[PDB]
Design a protein around this ligand. Structure first.
Ligand SMILES: CCCCCCCCCCCCCCCCCC(=O)OC[C@H](COP(=O)([O-])OCC(O)COP(=O)([O-])OC[C@@H](COC(=O)CCCCCCCCCCCCCCCCC)OC(=O)CCCCCCCCCCCCCCCCC)OC(=O)CCCCCCCCCCCCCCCCC
Ligand SMILES: CCCCCCCCCCCCCCCCCC(=O)OC[C@H](COP(=O)([O-])OCC(O)COP(=O)([O-])OC[C@@H](COC(=O)CCCCCCCCCCCCCCCCC)OC(=O)CCCCCCCCCCCCCCCCC)OC(=O)CCCCCCCCCCCCCCCCC
Ligand SMILES: CCCCCCCCCCCCCCCCCC(=O)OC[C@H](COP(=O)([O-])OCC(O)COP(=O)([O-])OC[C@@H](COC(=O)CCCCCCCCCCCCCCCCC)OC(=O)CCCCCCCCCCCCCCCCC)OC(=O)CCCCCCCCCCCCCCCCC
Ligand SMILES: CCCCCCCCCCCCCCCCCC(=O)OC[C@H](COP(=O)([O-])OCC[N+](C)(C)C)OC(=O)CCCCCCCCCCCCCCCCC
Ligand SMILES: CCCCCCCCCCCCCCCCC[C@@H](O)O[C@H](CO[C@H](O)CCCCCCCCCCCCCCC)COP(=O)(O)OCC[N+](C)(C)C
Ligand SMILES: CCCCCCCC/C=C\CCCCCCCC(=O)OC[C@H](COP(=O)(O)OCCN)OC(=O)CCCCCCC/C=C\CCCCCCCC
Ligand SMILES: CCCCCCCCCCCCCCCCCC(=O)OC[C@H](COP(=O)(O)OCCN)OC(=O)CCCCCCCCCCCCCCCCC
Ligand SMILES: CCCCCCCCCCCC(=O)OC[C@H](COP(=O)([O-])O)OC(=O)CCCCCCCCCCC
Ligand SMILES: Nc1ncnc2c1ncn2[C@@H]1O[C@H](COP(=O)(O)OP(=O)(O)O)[C@@H](O)[C@H]1O
Lengths: 320, 347, 56, 459, 121, 49, 98
């Protein structure tokens, strides 16, 4: 049966299921770094499940079929548009930032659920606690507004105040000129239009706020490009991190039960991502909301519950 | 809180209420009230926060004062009669003390403030349990001792409850405070009909409990605690908003819905006793309750308020937890008017 | 085909069968009010040799 | 009455199980069939009513109203299918369900044999109407209009419930036959005065009486076309039907308590006609015309003579048909130009000829042009009021003059003159709209041919 | 409490043995049909809330809803009929036992009764 | 196979279906028997048949 | 009725008035709440002893038991309020508004 209070009183215990290697590891870095490769290698060598960066359409990947939905029905934002015209008058920048924050929150909830119900560790290519660096970079470049920043802070507080911090934070530090060189070599025009200050602001936010903040919670590993390219030493350093001053040692079976009940309910996870704060960037009118909702319900496997979609090939509906 | 501890506290609350409803001794009735309060306080304080702590403190203070007054009434009745059996009390002063204590427990005006305060303080499940059970028990005691209730005092408190509930619900925007003021008004109706037909009191209690359960389950389903939070539910699951609109129409007493039956039967019974001004005033005052029900219905169902952008992800995901008996509560709170003559079975 | 047409045009019988059922229920309601049949002072009469009731 | 009630309760599943493109066709066809079936109730007796069972009965007053409701449903369906093309299938089905529920409640209201059941049903008619108004109205004022309508009606009706339960306790039964055969005189006392006030005030608010009418312009102007059609044709006649039914037990107190209501009705009829003379909105003009006609009906009922009841019934039926037709015409012109201002669109006589003919016929029937049943009812009421007193002729003549003035003013402003130069989206009139107008107007002339079918039991 | 405390009333007894002497409700009682209709509506609302096909999904669930509603409605109708019959029985017994309070009255025709006439003009 | 993740109600819960159908059948049989017994007892008590 | 009962009832009335009129401290109101049950205990045992209700002598003990249960509940709420606000003042219990 599904996990619940009856299962808890029956005897399913998170501490019993944990195998001393159930660790949450988040690899962070600036734009166009080797953090993805480092996360892949750490997840492979340590046997942990890898969760790539929570971009747009991650919720599409985790629901229905794996195929991503239309941009109009999932996100209503464009990273390419943000790169081309950051100071748009339609709120694209903050729409994208809020949608990406919600996606990262959902991915963190999924990773925590996997760790608590399986005992296997998770390696995230980015987390909730490192998402604000893009918001700070956007605000300091004038791309978004102070009201947008305040709304993001409110949502971040009321949402992330409920989840446990990562066990390990591995940050890959790369100087801005090397970042721009890698961007130039990659050849994608949209990110080739990225200015130098925007890349500098992300680095300033990472070094001055994120790393000092996460250092108090637990140990933080900082690597350069050359060190990160060799993942054997990274894995060896992770393995010999016996210190743990976070809340994970303090957690008990009841607290883990509450956390699992929270993370397995996705609507309860995303409850405060839609709070009635009518910013022009994110507010959607009644008519557009109704039309888009009608289209989403008109999608193939979305009109009814997952077990009750006839057009996708579900049978025995009359006895289900 | 551990699930075993939570379920044993709930069972202790229900055990206290059952002890009150089955006891024939005033001391055992008082014991049941004390046990109910003692096991109820942690239920209110389950989700720890300053608001929950303050609500629990206020509720405990009010219930402790009411229990002290009730025990004093019991002792005074013992002094003048030497009897412990719960029957028509033998002293008017003891009866007045008992009536005031039970009114304070029920939240009747002018002892009402704690009802909206605690209801706003506590969560939706706690508010549901509070309203339902903590109105169930003292009304049982009042029905037992109805034959000695002072009609003037009881009707004064009932009319005050109706007026105050209507006005408070008219002003409020928070859903829990609206529900609390609706509870105050319905308690006023039930206690008004109490000194004439305890069967009608029980009928109104059953209908009110059904409607309140349906409304609170719908609010839990929508995960909305304010008006604007409820205004986004049409974009995620419009069925819930439509069912809630029908339930709100029922709660206002609009025919041919279930909510009209208690008012109709109470008006008939009170008119049988050559009372016309009181039923007319009680019927006219309910228009305030209907007005703020309709104002809530405009925001949620009959119109379409602006939405946000992450509602798309909310669309993509599905409601996992199920509240069983919610369809039954929705049906029974809207479509049981033709089955009215079952009140004889209730008799 | 017939099966496809009937699957779409089966609702058109609902109102006619409701009318038939309503007429039947009217007959049943009338058959419960035969307390003064052939006993009203204005219309009282002797039965014909080959009829059992004056009206149904 | 089950042979008419059950087919509607079967129309509901038909609407909810029909295909997405056949809902209007199915609903219209079967509504017309139900109307044809309900035409059988016009065969009334000359001595007593048609008592089907212990719950439902039909009378020479109930039959024409039931036939009007059953005939009005398909016209509402046509107008709704006109203005609800872009709605989703579920919302179209919900709208049709609201219309069906309203018709069912109206049928049970007009056929209810007991006062308390009549009260329950005629109060139940509010919920579908309120939902329709506040959900499918176009303007921002639909919410305020719904609030006004609901609270006026309920503030009127709650003392009526108290009075009905008190009458049941005092006399033993609320059955109409019992309260008619066992009626006793109402002595002059404060208690009887307030019972009379409760009943009459509930039905006056439903009429509406002058000074209690604001909800009528608010609701009629801001409701959708189907809501406006049903509000004026049938829902206004609940007050008149109730007053005709309830005044059995209120005598002889009605001879003395009718003065304020008669004065209000007459002077407010004059005032609302004058208001129609200076209205900048077409729907408001039609609503105030409805107010004047129902004030005349109130006068007839209050004076309470056999000649007044017949005129009252005829005027109710004729006003229902005429008001429905006028609202439909105004809605067509609104759909053309998306605005209710009367002087915005002109020259419609030279832009749409046959629609101008429909406008002319509707305006001719609105004023009392003989031998129309409008004129029959108005003339009977005027003669009864003349017998009551000889200055009522002065008031009725002033009202008739202003009625003709504002009717022809509306016709001339909307049709005559030169067309607006910049309005170039007035497409030729649709076959559906022309059929709607024809179905509105032809039964009126047929009832003119056969007038005794709508003159009530007093004939 | 009118009928509470009636002599010989067994506590917590939904239907006493003396209720067996009354005609049981017919299985085709319109009240029972309305109870089944309520059960069907409950099943439809269940499907709608859980986002299943309203008329198709969960036929077994709809059947159980209807059956449970019919069962409880049948027993509720039995109890209601018993209580009303008991009320009428007690009322008739009291009327029999108090002839002084309920005396027969002389019946005079309308030819003998003088009623004032109020003209309508 | 349309869903990336197995739906919670992909396959009918045959135990629940059997329980539901059996409960419905048992309740109907019990109601029929109860009505028959009630009719017989009423006839016996009132001396009809 | 003798004057001893008068004094005991007056004591209960004084304790009840003291509870209903807060000054600053929640602890003082708890003390007033404990006094009411003390007066109730004294009144009940004076009534029972005088009338020789032999089986009723166990009632005051149960009264004391539930009195101190209420006292424990009040102390728990008071320590939570103190941890929240720094003082046991009832002025800080104003987040919720009627
Ligand atoms: C197996 C599958 C896996 C497990 C599934 C969950 C069940 C596990 C066992 C269990 O009972 O857990 C719930 C819970 C333990 O789990 P938990 O994690 O603490 O749940 C937290 C929330 O309750 C969880 O929040 P929630 O939103 O789920 O709330 C659950 C609960 C919350 O409500 C309650 O806990 C009881 C409230 C009762 C209020 C009064 C009801 C009406 C009274 C009418 C009186 C006559 C008129 O119920 C409701 O919210 C509405 C249910 C219907 C109530 C009305 C029924 C009328 C008949 O236990 C109880 O609530 C007590 C159960 C026994 C109560 C009756 C004793 C006699
Ligand atoms: C039976 C016909 C109806 C009779 C009504 C009479 C009164 C009893 C009501 C019982 C209702 C039960 C079902 C409730 C849930 C319905 C949910 C729904 O959408 O259903 C759509 C569903 C079909 O669409 P679907 O795609 O499957 O639905 C998927 C989504 O739910 C599609 O939804 P969506 O996600 O697209 O969302 C759109 C929609 C979603 O929301 C809704 O659709 C509303 C759902 C709740 C409605 C209220 C439920 C009942 C509450 C009490 C009603 C009291 C009525 C009396 C008082 C006066 C009026 C209030 O939201 C809106 O439109 C929002 C704007 C409008 C809001 C304001 C109006 C709300 C309703 C107020 C009036 C309530 C009374 C009429 C209710 C009619 C319900 C069909 O329609 C039905 O299931 C209709 C019933 C079909 C019965 C078939 C039976 C077998 C065949 C015929 C046999 C006949 C007898 C034969 C005898 C033997 C002959 C030989
Ligand atoms: C279609 C029905 C339309 C209403 C007709 C009412 C009078 C006739 C009833 C009748 O004979 O039914 C027997 C017939 C089947 O019985 P049968 O086996 O042929 O035997 C005939 C009896 O011997 C015949 O015995 P009887 O003539 O002595 O009938 C006794 C009847 C006499 O009761 C009355 O005269 C009172 C009727 C009004 C009750 C209060 C209505 C409040 C306003 C309507 C909305 C309520 C909320 C929805 O009292 C009851 O049945 C008490 C329970 C109420 C059942 C009817 C509920 C009608 C709701 C209409 C909506 O049942 C039906 O035709 C309907 C049964 C219920 C299922 C459908 C419910 C309505 C669905 C649409 C809802 C739209 C909203
Ligand atoms: C603060 C300012 C408030 C201003 C409020 C103004 C309201 C004006 C509109 C309502 C009253 C209309 C009165 C018209 C004048 C004639 C009165 C009259 O005929 O009196 C004698 C009449 C008849 O008395 P009579 O004088 O014919 O009696 C003589 C006959 N014998 C000898 C047998 C006694 O008096 C009554 O009818 C008394 C009962 C009236 C009950 C109240 C209802 C009146 C109508 C209410 C309408 C509400 C909606 C409109 C207002 C909003
Ligand atoms: C629609 C509103 C909610 C309705 C749901 C109510 C649920 C009630 C819960 C119990 C139902 C089943 C009970 C069957 C077993 C218990 C029977 C017995 O224990 O109780 C009987 C009494 O209980 C009731 O009679 C049975 C339940 C009756 C509920 C009828 C609701 C009628 C509401 C009107 C609308 C119709 C709704 C139709 C669908 C429910 C006899 O006890 P008694 O010692 O002698 O009564 C003491 C009360 N006194 C002191 C005042 C006399
Ligand atoms: C001022 C105009 C009226 C203001 C309406 C305010 C609404 C609430 C008023 C409260 C009732 C006012 C007194 C009504 C008279 C009354 O209650 O009794 C009437 C009479 C007396 O009964 P008994 O007890 O048997 O008499 C003793 C015989 N030996 O009983 C009845 O007739 C019952 C009828 C109920 C009518 C009560 C309300 C009717 C008055 C309102 C006027 C019409 C409603 C107008 C709507 C506007 C709302 C303000
Ligand atoms: C899928 C949804 C299905 C919903 C209905 C399911 C149950 C249907 C009945 C199954 C059991 C049949 C049975 O055992 O019938 C016995 C009895 C028949 O009565 P009878 O013998 O004629 O009595 C005459 C007087 N003694 O039965 C009765 O008397 C029972 C009659 C009353 C209870 C049923 C009322 C009708 C059903 C609810 C209304 C809505 C139905 C909608 C159906 C839509 C299409 C599926
Ligand atoms: C009796 C001996 C036989 C054997 C024992 C049977 C025990 C009880 C049967 C168990 C029912 C069951 O398991 O399935 C319930 C089904 C649907 O299941 P689910 O998927 O919704 O959980 O359907 C339902 O959900 C049932 C709906 C009923 C709701 C309650 C109706 C209340 C009736 C009276 C109301 C006034
Ligand atoms: N919160 C955010 N706000 C704006 N842009 C973001 C956010 N998160 C990620 N992105 C964009 O997504 C892209 C992801 O690239 P990335 O995976 O970091 O490249 P690489 O894999 O080479 O390191 C980046 O260009 C970054 O600008």
């Amino acid at each position: 049966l599904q996990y619940g209070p009856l299962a808890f009183v029956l005897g399913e215990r998170t501490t019993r299921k944990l195998t001393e290697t159930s660790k949450v590891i988040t690899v962070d870095g600036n734009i166009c770094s080797g953090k993805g490769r480092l996360a892949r290698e750490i997840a492979e060598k340590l046997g942990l499940r890898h969760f790539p960066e929570a971009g747009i359409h991650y919720a599409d990947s985790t629901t229905g079929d794996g195929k991503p939905l239309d941009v109009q029905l999932s996100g209503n934002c464009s990273l390419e548009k943000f790169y081309d015209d950051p100071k748009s008058n339609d709120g694209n920048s903050y729409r994208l930032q809020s949608w990406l924050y919600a996606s990262r929150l959902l991915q963190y909830a999924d990773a925590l659920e996997h760790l608590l119900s399986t005992g296997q560790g998770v390696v995230l290519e980015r987390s909730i606690y490192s998402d604000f660096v893009f918001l700070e970079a956007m605000y300091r470049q004038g791309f978004i507004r102070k009201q947008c920043v305040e709304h993001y802070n409110e949502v971040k507080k009321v949402t992330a105040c409920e989840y446990l911090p990562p066990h390990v934070v591995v940050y890959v530090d790369v100087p801005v000129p090397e970042i721009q060189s890698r961007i130039q070599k990659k050849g994608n025009p949209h990110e080739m239009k990225i200015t130098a200050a925007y890349l500098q602001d992300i680095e300033n936010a990472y070094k001055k706020t994120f790393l000092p903040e996460m250092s108090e919670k637990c140990e933080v590993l900082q690597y350069s490009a050359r060190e990160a390219e060799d993942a054997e030493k990274v894995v060896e350093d992770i393995e010999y991190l016996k210190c743990d001053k976070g809340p994970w040692p303090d957690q008990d079976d009841r607290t883990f039960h509450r956390l699992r009940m929270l993370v397995q309910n996705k609507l309860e996870v995303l409850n405060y991502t839609t709070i009635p704060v009518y910013l022009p960037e994110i507010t959607i009118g009644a008519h557009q909301s109704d039309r888009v909702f009608q289209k989403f319900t008109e999608l193939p496997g979305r009109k009814y519950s997952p077990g009750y979609n006839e057009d996708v090939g579900d049978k025995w509906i009359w006895l289900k | 809180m551990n699930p075993i501890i939570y379920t044993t506290l709930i069972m202790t609350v229900m055990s206290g209420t059952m002890l009150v409803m089955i006891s024939s001794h005033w001391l055992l009735i008082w014991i049941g009230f004390e046990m109910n309060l003692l096991a109820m306080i942690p239920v209110l304080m389950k989700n720890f926060n300053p608001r929950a702590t303050e609500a629990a403190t206020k509720y405990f203070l009010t219930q402790a004062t009411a229990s002290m007054m009730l025990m004093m009434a019991i002792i005074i009745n013992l002094l003048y009669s030497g009897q412990w059996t719960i029957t028509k009390m033998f002293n008017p002063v003891a009866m007045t003390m008992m009536t005031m204590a039970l009114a304070m427990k029920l939240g009747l005006s002018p002892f009402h403030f704690w009802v909206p305060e605690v209801t706003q303080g506590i969560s939706l499940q706690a508010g549901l349990l509070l309203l339902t059970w903590q109105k169930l028990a003292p009304l049982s005691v009042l029905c037992q001792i109805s034959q000695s209730i002072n009609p003037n005092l009881m009707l004064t408190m009932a009319m005050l409850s109706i007026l105050i509930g209507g006005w408070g619900g008219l002003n409020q925007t928070q859903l829990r405070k609206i529900m609390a003021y609706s509870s105050i008004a319905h308690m006023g109706w039930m206690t008004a009909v109490l000194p004439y037909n305890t069967t009608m009191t029980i009928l109104n209690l059953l209908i009110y409990i059904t409607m309140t359960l349906a409304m609170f389950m719908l609010l839990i389903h929508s995960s909305a605690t304010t008006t604007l939070s409820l205004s986004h539910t049409w974009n995620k699951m419009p069925v819930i908003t439509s069912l809630m609109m029908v339930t709100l129409l029922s709660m206002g007493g609009l025919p041919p819905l279930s909510g009209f039956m208690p008012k109709w039967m109470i008006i008939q019974e009170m008119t049988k006793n050559e009372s016309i001004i009181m039923p007319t005033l009680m019927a006219m005052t309910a228009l305030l309750n209907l007005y703020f029900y309709m104002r809530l219905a405009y925001s949620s169902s009959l119109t379409m308020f602006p939405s946000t952008n992450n509602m798309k992800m909310k669309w993509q995901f599905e409601h996992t937890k199920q509240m069983k008996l919610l369809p039954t509560m929705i049906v029974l709170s809207t479509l049981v008017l033709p089955m009215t003559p079952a009140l004889s079975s209730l008799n | 085909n017939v099966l496809q047409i009937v699957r779409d045009h089966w609702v058109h019988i609902l109102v006619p069968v409701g009318f038939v059922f309503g007429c039947y229920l009217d007959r049943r309601s009338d058959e419960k009010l035969t307390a003064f049949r052939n006993k009203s002072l204005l219309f009282k009469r002797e039965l014909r040799p080959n009829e059992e009731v004056t009206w149904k | 009455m089950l042979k008419i009630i059950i087919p509607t309760t079967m129309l509901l599943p038909m609407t909810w199980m029909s295909k997405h493109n056949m809902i209007w066709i199915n609903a219209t066809v079967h509504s017309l069939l139900i109307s044809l079936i309900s035409l059988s109730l016009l065969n009334q007796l000359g001595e007593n009513s048609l008592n089907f069972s212990l719950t439902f009965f039909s009378d020479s007053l109930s039959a024409p109203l039931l036939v009007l409701t059953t005939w009005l449903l398909p016209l509402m369906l046509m107008a709704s299918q006109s203005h609800l093309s872009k709605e989703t299938t579920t919302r179209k089905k919900l709208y049709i369900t609201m219309l069906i529920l309203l018709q069912l409640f109206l049928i049970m209201t007009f056929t209810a044999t007991e006062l308390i059941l009549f009260y329950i049903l005629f109060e139940a008619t509010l919920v579908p109407t309120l939902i329709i108004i506040t959900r499918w109205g176009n303007q921002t004022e639909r919410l305020n209009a719904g609030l006004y309508f609901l609270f006026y009606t309920l503030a009127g009706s709650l003392p009526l419930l108290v009075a009905l339960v008190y009458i049941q306790n005092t006399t033993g039964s609320l059955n109409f036959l019992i309260i008619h055969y066992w009626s006793h005189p109402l002595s002059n006392s404060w208690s009887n005065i307030f019972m009379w006030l409760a009943c009459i005030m509930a039905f006056m608010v439903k009429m509406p009486l002058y000074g209690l009418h604001l909800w009528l312009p608010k609701a009629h102007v801001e409701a959708p076309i189907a809501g406006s059609m049903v509000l004026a044709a049938v829902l206004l006649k609940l007050g008149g039907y109730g007053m005709m039914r309830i005044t059995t037990i209120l005598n002889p107190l009605t001879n003395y308590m009718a003065y304020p209501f008669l004065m209000l009705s007459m002077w407010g009829m004059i005032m609302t006609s004058s208001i129609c003379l200076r209205q900048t909105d077409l729907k408001s003009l039609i609503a105030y015309s409805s107010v004047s006609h129902m004030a005349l009906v109130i006068v007839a009922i209050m004076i309470q003579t056999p000649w007044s009841f017949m005129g009252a019934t005829a005027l109710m039926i004729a006003h229902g048909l005429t008001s429905s037709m006028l609202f439909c015409l105004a809605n067509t012109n609104y759909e053309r130009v998306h605005s209710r201002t009367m002087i915005l669109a002109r020259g419609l006589q030279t832009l749409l000829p046959l629609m101008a003919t429909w406008w002319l016929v509707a305006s001719l029937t609105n004023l009392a042009l003989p031998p129309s049943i409008n004129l029959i009812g108005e003339l009977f009421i005027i003669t009864a009021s003349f017998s009551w007193s000889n200055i009522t002729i002065i008031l009725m003549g002033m009202n008739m003059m202003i009625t003709a003035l504002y009717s022809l003013y509306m016709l001339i402003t909307t049709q005559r003159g030169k067309y607006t130069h910049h309005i170039n989206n007035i497409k030729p009139s649709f076959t559906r709209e022309n059929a709607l107008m024809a179905l509105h107007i032809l039964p009126l002339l047929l009832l003119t041919l056969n007038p005794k079918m709508i003159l009530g039991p007093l004939y | 409490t009118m009928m509470s405390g009636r002599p010989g009333r067994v506590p917590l007894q939904f239907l006493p043995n003396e209720a067996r002497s009354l005609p049981p409700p017919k299985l085709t009682d319109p009240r029972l049909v309305y109870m089944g209709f309520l059960g069907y509506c409950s099943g439809l609302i269940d499907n709608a809330i859980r986002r299943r096909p309203v008329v198709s999904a969960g036929l077994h669930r709809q059947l159980l809803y209807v059956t449970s509603f019919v069962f409880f409605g049948y027993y509720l109708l039995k109890r209601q009929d018993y209580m009303y019959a008991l009320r009428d029985h007690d009322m008739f017994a009291y009327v029999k036992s108090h002839p002084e309070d309920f005396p027969e009255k002389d019946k005079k025709t309308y030819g003998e009764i003088l009623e004032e006439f109020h003209p309508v003009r | 196979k349309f869903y990336i993740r197995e739906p919670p109600h992909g396959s009918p819960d045959w135990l629940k279906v059997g329980l539901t159908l059996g409960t419905s059948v048992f309740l109907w049989i019990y109601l029929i028997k109860q009505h028959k017994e009630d009719v017989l007892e009423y006839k016996r008590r009132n001396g009809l048949e | 009725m003798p004057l001893v009962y008068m004094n005991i009832i007056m004591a209960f009335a004084i304790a009840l008035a003291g509870l209903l009129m807060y000054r600053s401290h929640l602890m003082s109101s708890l003390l007033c709440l404990e006094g009411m049950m003390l007066s109730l205990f004294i009144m009940s045992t004076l009534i029972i002893l005088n009338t020789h209700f032999t089986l009723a002598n166990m009632m005051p003990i149960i009264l004391l038991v539930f009195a101190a249960c209420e006292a424990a509940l009040g102390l728990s709420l008071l320590v939570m309020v103190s941890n929240t606000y720094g003082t046991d003042y009832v002025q800080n219990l104003n987040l919720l508004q009627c």
